[PDB]
Design a protein around this ligand. Structure first.
Ligand code: 10M
Lengths: 25, 104
């Protein structure tokens, strides 16, 4: 529940990281 | 429905692998002025026609991709055969608003 919701945020953060240029970087 | 950072990273690596294949194997454009194909880490861009918007489907690795099946991200290919940027140092202009997660 809580940990699932926090993983969901981690995933949004991962996508924001790619939008910001990811490994590029 | 499923949340998984692991699954999402793995889908992104697959989308990146498929993209690299396209970048390597897609035939060169019909000559000789075109903005160059690229993977910007979010999306895979094909070669652009000068003076055109280029649209690609929302990346299929997005956890919410099935909510945005007809959505597109955009770049603009200027008449000079360069991707539209902004200022001096910036990255290419991109619009991914159709691919965003929230309902509103
Ligand atoms: C500063 C504003 C000036 C705006 C001038 C005109 C804007 C150019 C449009 C951007 S490129 C365009 O994107 C379209 C997708 O949005 C693309 O359309 C495709 O997908 C659509 C899905 O909704 C659908 O409506 C169409 O049937 C389908 O062919 C279209 O090919 C592309 O040129």
């Amino acid at each position: 529940d809580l940990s699932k919701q926090m993983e969901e945020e981690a995933v949004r953060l991962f996508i924001e990281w790619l939008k910001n240029g990811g490994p590029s970087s | 429905a499923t949340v998984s950072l692991w699954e999402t990273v793995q889908k992104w690596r697959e989308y990146r692998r498929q993209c690299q294949r396209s970048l390597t194997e897609d035939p060169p454009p019909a000559t000789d002025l075109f903005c160059n194909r690229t993977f910007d880490e979010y999306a895979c861009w094909p070669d652009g026609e000068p003076g055109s918007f280029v649209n690609v489907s929302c990346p299929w690795y997005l956890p919410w991709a099935s909510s945005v099946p007809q959505g597109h991200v955009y770049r603009f290919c200027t008449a000079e055969g360069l991707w539209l940027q902004k200022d001096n140092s910036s990255l290419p202009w991109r619009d991914l608003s159709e691919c965003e997660e929230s309902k509103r």
